[PDB]
């Protein structure tokens, strides 16, 4: 009765087993979104920083937390726990830059035109560029300004995160056909959650599924910026986890 409800033009809202998952998933997001005061605490980085290595510096610091937020949200999901140590790791390395991105874009203030990193620092497109990310920063900023229209909610950001995390495409995965079922499950629940929210933007699900791809790009480019970085005459200022995540 899914494809059917489609043809009759009804938009299926979540079901019992789904509103469950949605809760289980929404909670995580919220239990790791330290949220009510970022636009408040957000420290504007001195514009003379990143006009780079200095700005890179900052970023580098306040990043270990940012990676853990992803790490902790994954810990809460029983789907992510049913999987091996190995896939678990793979999965987190794969989705990490994707999640921090969302986290970065959802915190975009169209006003001062900056993104807020780690819920503390506020930087401009130029600062994030010259800091060591180049194009990716335009990709994250541009994403942000697009999401400032999707008006996502804790659930929507959360389930997004979830779809990012359960990627059966990551190289090395062992339990492939199972992470897919888990993904497939999240996607469905997302759509349904979407219908239930009934936004007023046509193609919301298609539009939104494109951000998933976009985030995957940023993610891919970021791996390429992470190589252009390791040079610069490497070593120092590269936090251990930041290094383990992306190798
Ligand atoms: O904190 C969050 O939750 C999100 C977050 C944190 C930071 I610091 C950030 O900037 C990056 C990311 C990768 C990278 O290689 C470099 I240098 C800087 C992004 I974009 C997002």
What are the strands, taking DSSP E only, across the chain?
43-44, 108-109, 114-117, 121-123
- Please check whether residue 45 is in contact with residue 90, taking contact to mean a CB–CB distance below 8 angstroms: no
- The residue whose CA has the least distance to atom 7 of ligand 1 is 117
* Number of CB atoms found within 10 A of residue 212's CB: 16
Class of CATH domain 1-247: mainly alpha
Q: Does the annotation flag 222 for ligand binding?
A: yes
Q: Are 99 and 70 in contact (CB under 8 A)?
A: yes
- Using a 10 angstrom Cβ sphere, with 0-12 exposed, 13-18 middle and 19 or more buried, the burial of residue 35 is exposed
Q: Are 140 and 105 within 8 A, CB to CB?
A: yes
Cα angle value 196/144/152 (rounded, 5°): 15
Give the span between the Cα atoms of 110 and 194, in whole angstroms. 25
Q: Which atom of ligand 1 is nearest to the CA of 70?
A: 3
Alpha carbon distance 78, 190 (integer Å): 17
Order of strands, edge to edge, in the sheet holding 108-109?
43-44, 121-123, 114-117, 108-109
Domain ranges in the chain?
1-247
Angle in degrees, CA 15, 166, 204, rounded to 5: 55
- CA of 110 from ligand 1 middle (Å) equals 19
| Cα 131 to averaged position of ligand 1 atoms, centre (Å) | 10
User: Does 130 show up as a binding residue in the annotation?
Assistant: no
Degrees, nearest 5: CA angle 60-62-65: 115
| Integer Cα distance of 68 and 169 in angstroms | 22
β-pairing verdict for 43-44 and 114-117: unpaired
Residue 222 half-sphere exposure toward CB, CA atoms < 13 A: 25
């Amino acid at each position: 009765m899914e494809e059917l409800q489609k043809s009759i033009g009804h938009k299926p809202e979540p079901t019992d087993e789904e509103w469950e998952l949605i809760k289980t998933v929404t909670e995580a997001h919220v239990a790791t979104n330290a949220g009510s005061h970022w636009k408040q605490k957000r420290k504007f980085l001195p514009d003379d920083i990143g006009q780079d290595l200095e700005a890179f510096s900052h970023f580098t610091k306040i990043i270990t937390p940012a990676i853990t937020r992803v790490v902790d949200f994954a810990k809460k999901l029983p789907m992510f726990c049913e999987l091996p140590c190995e896939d678990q790791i793979i999965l987190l390395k794969g989705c990490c830059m994707e999640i921090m991105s969302l986290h970065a874009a959802v915190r975009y203030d169209p006003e001062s035109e900056t993104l807020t990193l780690n819920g503390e620092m506020a930087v401009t497109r130029g600062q994030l560029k010259n800091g060591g990310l180049g194009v990716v920063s335009d990709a994250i900023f541009d994403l942000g300004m697009s999401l400032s229209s999707f008006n996502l909610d804790d659930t929507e950001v959360a389930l997004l995160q979830a779809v990012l995390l359960m990627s059966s495409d990551r190289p090395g995965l062992a339990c492939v056909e199972r992470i897919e079922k888990y993904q497939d499950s999240f996607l469905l629940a997302f759509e349904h959650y979407i219908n239930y929210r009934k936004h007023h933007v046509t193609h919301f699900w298609p539009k939104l599924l494109m951000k998933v791809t976009d985030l995957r790009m940023i993610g891919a480019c970021h791996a390429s910026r992470f190589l252009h970085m390791k040079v610069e005459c490497p070593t120092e200022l590269f936090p251990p986890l930041f290094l383990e995540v992306f190798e």
